[PDB]
Design a protein around this ligand. Sequence first.
Ligand SMILES: Cc1cc2nc3c(=O)[nH]c(=O)nc-3n(C[C@H](O)[C@H](O)[C@H](O)COP(=O)(O)OP(=O)(O)OC[C@H]3O[C@@H](n4cnc5c(N)ncnc54)[C@H](O)[C@@H]3O)c2cc1C
Ligand SMILES: Nc1ccn([C@@H]2O[C@H](COP(=O)(O)OP(=O)(O)OC[C@H]3Oc4nc5nc(N)nc(O)c5nc4C(S)=C3S)[C@@H](O)[C@H]2O)c(=O)n1
Ligand code: FES
Ligand code: FES
Ligand code: FES
Ligand code: FES
Ligand SMILES: [Cu+2]
Lengths: 161, 158, 286, 795, 152, 46
Amino acid sequence: KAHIELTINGHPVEALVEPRTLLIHFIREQQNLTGAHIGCDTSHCGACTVDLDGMSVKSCTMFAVQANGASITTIEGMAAPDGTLSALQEGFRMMHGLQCGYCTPGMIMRSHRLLQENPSPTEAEIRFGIGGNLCRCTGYQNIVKAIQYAAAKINGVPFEE
Amino acid sequence: KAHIELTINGHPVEALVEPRTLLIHFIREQQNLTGAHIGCDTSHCGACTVDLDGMSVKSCTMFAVQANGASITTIEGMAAPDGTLSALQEGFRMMHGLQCGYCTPGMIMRSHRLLQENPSPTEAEIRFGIGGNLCRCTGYQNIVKAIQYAAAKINGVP
Amino acid sequence: MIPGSFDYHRPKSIADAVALLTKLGEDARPLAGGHSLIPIMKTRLATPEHLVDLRDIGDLVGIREEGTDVVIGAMTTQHALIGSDFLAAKLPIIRETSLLIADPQIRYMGTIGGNAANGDPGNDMPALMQCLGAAYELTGPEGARIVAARDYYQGAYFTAIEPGELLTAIRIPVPPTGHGYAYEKLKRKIGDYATAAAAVVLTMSGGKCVSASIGLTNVANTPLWAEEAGKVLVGTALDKPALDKAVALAEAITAPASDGRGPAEYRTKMAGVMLRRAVERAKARA
Amino acid sequence: AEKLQGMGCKRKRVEDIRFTQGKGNYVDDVKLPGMLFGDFVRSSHAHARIKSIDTSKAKALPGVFAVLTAADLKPLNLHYMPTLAGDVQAVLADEKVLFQNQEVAFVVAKDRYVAADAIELVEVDYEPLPVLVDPFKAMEPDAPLLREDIKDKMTGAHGARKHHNHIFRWEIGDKEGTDATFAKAEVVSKDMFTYHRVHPSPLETCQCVASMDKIKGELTLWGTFQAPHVIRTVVSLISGLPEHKIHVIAPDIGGGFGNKVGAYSGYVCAVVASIVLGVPVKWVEDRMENLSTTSFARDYHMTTELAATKDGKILAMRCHVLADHGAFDACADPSKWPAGFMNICTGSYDMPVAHLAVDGVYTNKASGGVAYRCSFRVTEAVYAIERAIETLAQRLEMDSADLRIKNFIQPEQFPYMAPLGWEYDSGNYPLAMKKAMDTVGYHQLRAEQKAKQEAFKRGETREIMGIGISFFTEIVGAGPSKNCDILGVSMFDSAEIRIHPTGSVIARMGTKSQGQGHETTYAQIIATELGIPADDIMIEEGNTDTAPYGLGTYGSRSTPTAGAATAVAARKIKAKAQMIAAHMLEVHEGDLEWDVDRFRVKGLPEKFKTMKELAWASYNSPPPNLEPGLEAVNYYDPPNMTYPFGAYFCIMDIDIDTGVAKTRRFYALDDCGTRINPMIIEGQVHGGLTEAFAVAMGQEIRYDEQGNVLGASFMDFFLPTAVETPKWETDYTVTPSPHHPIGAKGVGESPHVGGVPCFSNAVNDAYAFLNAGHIQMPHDAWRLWKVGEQLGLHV
Amino acid sequence: DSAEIRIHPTGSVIARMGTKSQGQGHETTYAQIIATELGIPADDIMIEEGNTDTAPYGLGTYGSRSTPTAGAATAVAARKIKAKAQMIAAHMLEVHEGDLEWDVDRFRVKGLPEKFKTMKELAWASYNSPPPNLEPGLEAVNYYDPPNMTYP
Amino acid sequence: TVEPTSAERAEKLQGMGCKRKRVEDIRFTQGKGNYVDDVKLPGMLF
Ligand SMILES: Cc1cc2nc3c(=O)[nH]c(=O)nc-3n(C[C@H](O)[C@H](O)[C@H](O)COP(=O)(O)OP(=O)(O)OC[C@H]3O[C@@H](n4cnc5c(N)ncnc54)[C@H](O)[C@@H]3O)c2cc1C
Ligand SMILES: Nc1ccn([C@@H]2O[C@H](COP(=O)(O)OP(=O)(O)OC[C@H]3Oc4nc5nc(N)nc(O)c5nc4C(S)=C3S)[C@@H](O)[C@H]2O)c(=O)n1
Ligand code: FES
Ligand code: FES
Ligand code: FES
Ligand code: FES
Ligand SMILES: [Cu+2]
């Protein structure tokens, strides 16, 4: 086993992992951060998406050892300490951007980086921008609305209807 | 912290403990063997009784470090590997020797050693023999019956 | 329930234990069976910085006859005392007393040395050892020495032991074969320290008492050897007039505490009643 | 037939399987992610103002997450909590402390070891105030003002408000008629009997694990609660959290004996701490804190009087009680009964009139009063009348068994309206008293006693013999909605029973066992009603999200209330099954008759449907007019209490020179109507008689002049071991409750209620020939030595 | 399919059904049905499904059957509670049930709107002062056998 | 709004016909849903 040290949701983390342990399992099985989910075995769904060193990464396609020294944010790290939900979490609820909730953590983590890449995206940029995340429940329409809501909240001004 | 190694219910156990950690807390809190109970803070009740190196010991009155290298049996270790209850566990049930069940693990662990010290005890020997164990529910009468029942079952095994 | 933190030590020999106790100082305490020390550590009345466990010192456990004495290692448990048929043949009063101490679990751990070194007037072995005229062997940094049990206790938790010393063994003179003996204890329930208890050993010849020695438990801030009381019995037929005199002399030296077991006057009277009953059983056995 | 194990069977307990293997689930066995531990810095003073509390050193200690003081609770209006008696109790001492060991600050740390360390670091500066511990002086003009928060220095009894230390005055009965009878009766027998302060001391202390889920806004609270639903409702009312978001869970409880009915500061503090920190907080008290700060029992000073004719007819009873409630009135009781059912004190005797008055007072002691198998002060009521019967008998120079027989309420007089308001349901006292007397050879014992007394007078023995008698009438099953409620909630109870497609059952009740065998016995009731094997039935209690609302387990109310609800709910299921059978058999329901486990067509016994077939049919071929499924619920509001009774006889031998007493024989006849499980009833009696023995012969909690609580640890608190506990001889008669669905009355507390007077009457009876008068409990050795000392027996 | 609805003394609710959501929003929508039927805000109602020890027996969620079956059972169970609440109101207001009319969350006496009892008051009364002929508490169950399918 | 109108009281119910926001969203948007693979028990094998 290899010894790794990193930062997850702002807190230092130290652990022992086998090299072959996928980051998604290190996060879910060892750190008990079970918000991230597994939806496939071919790297298509994005349900395992976490924000790592400023990048949206599919944690089922990286080994925990590769993240040694990294800073990771998972869905559990999105809400504010005062309990207030982030703009994105609120937007997903207000716009009905989730149903079973399975793709939600990965969708919100991807969206968190998308709005930093482009604070005021068009509908086309939003759809392309979350192309790595599959959802079986929503048909995506309300997810696009949720992301627009969050962007307007963050920006203090709306853009597209 | 001190490194200790011992055997509990036939299994090797190794751990790091503060010397002041009482054995009862090591068993309940670190090993998650929650059968043993705490019923007092003065060493009178015996609810924390375990079998340690052939002795009945009140684990709230010993530090885990004192047990380094010991062999301990707790209530979870009384049933047979195939799940069958020991004569004492069966006797307590058949004779209604428990109600709330709080003193039971300690009562059965003490009894286990008592019947090894004296396989065929009289009632006076049984009552005196469990003098270090308090029960609030039973009035002890059925516990005496439970122990007599177990002795008869054990004496029939050979 | 929770003791303060401390460092733990496991010396392999008496020499090592003594050196450690001498070095560490007043903040270090020997740990024997732990059944008086741990309870007071849990209430934080005792907050030692170091515990020196005597567990690994084999030379502290054992029962042997040496010359006209039986020598018992300080770490010998109450359970071991009761189990010794050799001891029951020579000093039957010990098994009788031990069976009146605490309960099975505590007897599996509690040691005779710890019972004698404690300084709690509630302990039963001290006055028994005074009755028997036992001597305590102590080993400290300055060497070995002996202190009679009769001279060892000064008050609650106050004894003759010095810094760095360990009580290593108890040397007990063997009474004449056929001697009478008895330990009579009055308590509220199993495990309770005595309201009052009396230890008696005596010998008889031609219907008259030849020798008699009496110890009184928990009826003063220390155990008591009732010297005058035993003296008055010698030369008598141990009849009521003799017993009355012995009771007067024993009661006279008591100064019990008034606590849950009752007021001082009751405990003084009970020291007398336990003494009468013990003399009676001892007389029958002699 | 072998598999049914219904009513009457000595069914072995289902609880034993897990308990004998260490797999029960008690509060301290609970471990949750991020769980912290909290405990209290407690008061070293009985009465003093709190000048300052320095928690800086404690908060600075590594591993300490919080240290709460009253200053922190006020903003939530939580520095005081409501009590079942309608008063308030301090959660954390604010301006002053009123009893030794009272809660002052709550330290929350990573574990119980660090918490203990931190508690030692908190420094409290106290300003001593005069201590009040003698209730007989609590209302003198110069008595210390304890409750500054609710009272104003009222040093009298003729002001707008009682006296600053007076809690309440409660009276019942015909005062004018009672007084008039006492004014003319040939004989007046008066004594002041004190029922000393003791404590229920369950082997498991009080504790909880509070877990506020701040993400969901829901509180889960595991705890030692005898009334979990009531706790949920109270928590909701004081926290502002709605009940559907508070999940209270009373898991396995290691005995309660009344100690776990009320709420304690520890529960409130753990909940507040968890709400503040967002992580679980466990609180588990040690024994010394349990005995000195949780519900005490008894502490009644009873001036008791009987008026009678020279020939032994009882004409009236007059009783006044001075009740010591400690610093706060936290005495459990239905809200309209500040002295519980102490008005059952005319007992088993037919008296024309009576009067009872009770004054409660505050003292610098822990709160409580109702606990330890008291049935709401019935222990005190029975002690008062059974001791009074004996002292009247002595004054009349009459055998007390004959005095009782001459005054028993007769079988034909039931339902009997007693002079203090309770209507007894059923009872055959003469038959039970006769069976008891014949079993123990009563008259032979009296002859033996007489000869032993003469031998004592001749100097031939130092042992005296006493014969104790206790014939009692209990009152249990607190529930008529008309007069019984817990803080406004009527005292009914409940049962919900659901039958699965394949015939097994899940049933839940609003009560909560702490060892009484409910998980075994409620199944026996259903088994008999429906013909379904008891092992095919699962019984659950204690989870407020799932069990129907109930008022909990105390006052031996489980069988009278939830036991009745279980039978009524099962009968609703039986009625629906009969409709299903009628549909399947194509007959009118009137043409069907129930036969153990099936409905048969009258006359054509070959045509039938078993409960199992009907359960399947309710899901597979539901009759068109009926809803599918087979389940029912019943919330049972009892029409009256149940009144079990007993005849107890104790033969006691006492060494007058040491004061040591030894029970020679103890016979206990109990009649609780229909007996569901004889094995479990026997166990309840053994336990209760053991408590009675302990209370009468040695148990006590005392306070000295400085307010120091004394004897509050197992170093002194008399809990008998197997060596001291007498062997018990039990017997019974069966006099069903006419109004109960299965004729069953409660019985759990009877042994303690009747046992204490039995033991105390035996001790008092032993010394009666020496004119000792009334000897106050406990009868331990030093106190009986003092009795002999004062009678001149030692010189 | 089925529904069981239990009203607490203070007016909040725990209700369970024999269906099982896999994202269709049952925990939100079943509460809306009950809210309208009883005049209790949806946020004061907790909905649960899926634990066979606690939820009433049902056949599950598939065939878009939840609303047609358990949705119906929820309405019928709530209506049983409302009928009992009406009885409690008549008893308390001392009028005949026929003299009462429902106004969103309370029963008012016809022609005398100032005389009324809210569902919240009735829930407390069901535990605090149950009418003599009624059992204490306020809850109900319904197992609904549909007369036909629905054809959207 | 102490004694809200019938309309106001009906609106507060968030009952039938309203676009009530989902209660499930609170836990799901925070990764606090409890799906089968999130379950961990003592001694659990795969
Ligand atoms: C519930 C209960 C009931 C009891 N009832 C009784 C009773 O009825 N009668 C009775 O006699 N006892 C009673 N005891 C006390 C028991 O017998 C203790 O075992 C005994 O008092 C102390 O012996 P120990 O070996 O446990 O010593 P420890 O507790 O280890 O130590 C006692 C003290 O002696 C010191 N010490 C120990 N060994 C030595 C040594 N060799 N040299 C120098 N110092 C040493 C320790 O440093 C400490 O200060 C009871 C104890 C309990 C918990
Ligand atoms: N006619 C009857 C009456 C009772 N029983 C059985 O006896 C048991 C006790 O029933 P009941 O008399 O209704 O009393 P509760 O169950 O309501 O118990 C409460 C009572 O229980 C007592 N006994 C206790 N026993 C244990 N082990 N633990 C407690 O905490 C106890 N607390 C005390 C105190 S205090 C009280 S108030 C139940 O299994 C019942 O089915 C029976 O077989 N037939
Ligand atoms: S689990 Fe599907 S991309 Fe990672
Ligand atoms: S909400 Fe179900 S997969 Fe997206
Ligand atoms: S917990 Fe009571 S003797 Fe150990
Ligand atoms: S069974 Fe409850 S303490 Fe013994
Ligand atoms: Cu009671």
